[PDB]
Amino acid sequence: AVEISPDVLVYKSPLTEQSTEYASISNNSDQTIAFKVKTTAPKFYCVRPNAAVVAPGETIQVQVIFLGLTEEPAADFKCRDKFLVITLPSPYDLNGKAVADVWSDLEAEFKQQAISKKIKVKYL
C-alpha cells in the first residue's frame, strides 16, 4: 500500500562533518496520503520535507541531513537516534494550509489507520 524505506540510515565517517542520507515514501494506493517524520535527535538532524502529501503512484524522497559531531565517537558506539515516519490518509483538500497545519486533526481522525515505520540510525 504505502512503502517506507530504508530500515536503517547509515552515516559514514568522518562523523564530524555533515552528510545527507535519504529515506523515501511511495504511495502505491489509489488515494493521496500524508506523512510526518519525527526526529528523536532534532539538534543533530534536519529533515526535509518533514511533512507532506504523496499522490497515488508518487514517491517522495526525504533528505535526512546529519549535522555532524564535535568529535569522532568510539568505534563501538551505538547511535540510538531514530526517525518515526507516520503516514495517514489525506482525503480532504488542505485549502492551502500545510500538512503540519492539519496533521493534528488528520491524526486525531485516522490514528488507528496509520502506517508507520521506525527508521534506525547507524554510525559507520
d(C-alpha 13, C-alpha 57), whole Å: 35
CATH classification at residue 106: 2.60.40.10
CB 69 within 8 A of CB 79: no
Could you tell me the three cell numbers for 69? 559531531
Split into its structural domains, the chain has a count of: 1
CA angle 29, 54, 99 (to 5 degrees): 130
Which residues in the chain are immediately followed by a break of C to N over 2.5 Å?
Answer: none
For residue 106, what is its C-alpha cell? 488528520
Which DSSP symbol is given to 73? P
Take residue 5 and report the three cell numbers written for it: 524505506
Question: Which of 69, 62, 59, 52 has the alpha carbon at shortest distance from 9?
Answer: 62
Range of the structural domain that residue 40 is part of: 2-123
